[PDB]
Amino acid sequence: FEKFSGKDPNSKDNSVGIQLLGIVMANDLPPYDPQCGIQSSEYFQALVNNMSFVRYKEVYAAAAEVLGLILRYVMERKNILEESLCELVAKQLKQHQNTMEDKFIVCLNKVTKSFPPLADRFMNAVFFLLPKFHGVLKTLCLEVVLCRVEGMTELYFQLKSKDFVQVMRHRDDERQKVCLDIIYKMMPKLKPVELRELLNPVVEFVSHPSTTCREQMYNILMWIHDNYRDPESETDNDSQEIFKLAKDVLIQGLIDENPGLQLIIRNFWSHETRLPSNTLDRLLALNSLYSPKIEVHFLSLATNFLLEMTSMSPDYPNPMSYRHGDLPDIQIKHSSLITPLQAVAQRDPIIAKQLFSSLFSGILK
């Protein structure tokens, strides 16, 4: 601290000290305390104001690393003196915000990355902040929106319909979109129709870019779909109008393309959930969601599914000169190998109809 502490306006000499101090402190509950209050309290202060010091960012992560962890720190030990010191760092903040627009807050925020778990001090600002920062144009949606939104987190959910309504379609623009992705953690939240109205963009803008979006997007389209689960329930008609409309999407998500894992967890979900543990009916209503497809190669899909299913592993357990030793291989050993050899082979091709004997056998038998 001493070494470092004492940096000042336009002092780049902080830069080392800070980078360290974070990295140092980054170790594990600085033992016997950091003495950041114990050798002297206002080591705090210096660090704080230092955070404020200038346009020059450097404090940020430093402070952040400090401050976010600082609470993550003070949990495992005496919590107190860390705490209000923040509140200082707030007033620091609240200034920075109010003093001038961009770099101030946005810093405060990427900072606030590690910060959160106490809130409105930033929030009800960032309330206007962020959207005004749609006013302030580009990467705020990132840096800002990001920050705020992981700020929102538990137990805000209410006006999201409003704060958030002020934007999202206000960008097509992209790599931020993690946010638009991320934002939805609401399992029992926005459940009435508002939510579906919010679902309107769901695959609207998720389509073309790196599907990295899709990943989590659909992934919670799961959570929520369970949250809609309508097994002869009727939480409402419109509820199921979602629940299906969801399903529209959902199985549109049964369509993997470049990532397999798409269809992987997509499927296994389909298994324990969208499916029973069954062959025969699963074959039946299998078809049910095939109708909406209007889209191809799916056949392979339904099949291969039931190829995994038709033997999970009742296959190899029930499998049916050295050339004289191939004699028994071509006399008696096992027929099981075929089973995947089939599917895998048969997964890739074009018109393969053996599917269809499986079908009719899967019924007419």
Place this chain on the structure above:
Amino acid sequence: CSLLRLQETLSAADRCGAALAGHQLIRGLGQECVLSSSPAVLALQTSLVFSRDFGLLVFVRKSLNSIEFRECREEILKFLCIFLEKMGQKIAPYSVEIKNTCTSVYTKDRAAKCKIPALDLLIKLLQTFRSSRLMDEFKIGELFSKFYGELALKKKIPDTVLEKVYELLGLLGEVHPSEMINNAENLF
């Protein structure tokens, strides 16, 4: 298509005013234009994409007065002059069309010059200007050349855009036809 549909559609709804909406529009479809590219499919698929967004924006921002759309033609015109190099040729329809088009975009600066944008306007038109040029025209340019060489012949303007002050004065030189060349080298 999403290129084309999203462009003419969202850009079309934009005709009531767009602001960020259009621009990012122009951005994404424009910018994600080229980063998404393939021979055949995407190359000439664009060629029509570019083609008919030419036919679009000439109309669109031609109409559009200034407003948001000074900045919309930031987004575009930048994407334009940079999309010149996309096609060195197959330009001819868009050669001449963009010729008197961006001619009239000089004119759009002529409605309101300066501020921040209209700089960006004529400036982006300038690199729009030459890499465009294959020769391949005679008075389609030369006509333009004349009273461009008037429009810059004059007009106290910002320290910044002053490239245009000289911009075309030798670019008209690459236009070989004499008597305007006479005009300039007498004047210049």
Place this chain on the structure above:
Amino acid sequence: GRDSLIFLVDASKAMFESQSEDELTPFDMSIQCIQSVYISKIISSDRDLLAVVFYGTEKDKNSVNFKNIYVLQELDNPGAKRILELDQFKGQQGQKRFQDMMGHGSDYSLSEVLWVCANLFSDVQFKMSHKRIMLFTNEDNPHGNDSAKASRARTKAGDLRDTGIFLDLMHLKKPGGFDISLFYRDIISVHFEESSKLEDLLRKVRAKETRKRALSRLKLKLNKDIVISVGIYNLVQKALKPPPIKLYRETNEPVKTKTRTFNTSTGGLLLPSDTKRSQIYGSRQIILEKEETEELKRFDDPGLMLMGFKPLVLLKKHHYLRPSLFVYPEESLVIGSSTLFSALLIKCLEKEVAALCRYTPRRNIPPYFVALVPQEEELDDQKIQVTPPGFQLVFLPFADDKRKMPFTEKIMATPEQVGKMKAIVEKLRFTYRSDSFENPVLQQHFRNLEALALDLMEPEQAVDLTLPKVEAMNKRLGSLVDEFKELVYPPDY
């Protein structure tokens, strides 16, 4: 930078109603208030943006899609048929039609309204600073029924003030002008006074103009060896209008007229090359370059020099000419002239001495000798500043200043007069003020434009006295001017 200012009317129910009172609905009084500031920023012509919204009502205008609201307009510098567009709202026919046509009064909920208008602070796309809002209400009780609404007042309120966003309630006459003090804090949010009404607003802004401005920043080298940089400031310019703008006839639109030089003999052009900057006399025409002219200015550079120290009282008015506007010496950038400049003024004023300079205006000039009085620093308890600490930028007197003025004899008066004359003036004197002083006869035209602004019959046709009032002239003093008249003369005028 160009900021927010906000009109709002409260609604519970009876507010748009007159309380059955026989003058107006104080709602309407508010109406003309809105008129008054929005109009006001015609005159002041303020890049500040203005807000018109109501709530608490039957139907809605909003994007927040909730009961008991209306937007009226989004934040704006004004518009003529923005004015007119709002001009429907006077009159009982317009009271009602305004009401019902929009729907008038059902319910509301308070801090909901807070983030309503606040969320018109959402409306900011641009550079603003001042967050300033006004509620129009006589409401004595926001509600008694749900005190969770009250906790919501004391709750979001502090947020919105903490938002830097400030609404108060001017004393708009609920009876007594209000009778309520009690719980009221939440409802609301360089030495001056405050007022309860619009009239102050009305006239005060009738001529008013720009506020936040400091731009072109020069320097003063004190000696060759030591530094200050000098803030140029206009206490005013002798403020004038934004001047007549070119718009063509039926097209109504800006001409975008341009100008250059054709050849005025042959049909060709002309270029600054082709011409030059001349002086001509007698036989000889003499021609020298626009450059040659503009650099013949050159002596040093824009910037300033302590040229010395003079008795302040040395020159009062033997003289006067184009003012100091006020340069405040910058001290943030160059401080210690915090201290230096400080004790400078301290003791130079103490000396009754001043710092002469040679001021060199922007992109050079021929520079000129101009005194700088040290300007003292005047602040009261709440710090009225008449004398922002600084320098009087004191033009020196010169030949042209004295180029001519006559001298001849003078025949002189007698004390017989002054005995009366003094108190006569005591009747002619007034304690004057800083305020209500102008050349309105120019104001009257942005009245004449207030016309098209409202598109109405005759202007505000307001009142400042730049002209003397006869009842007082012939009143307080009387005709004793007669005594003076026949003192030494039977004039026949």
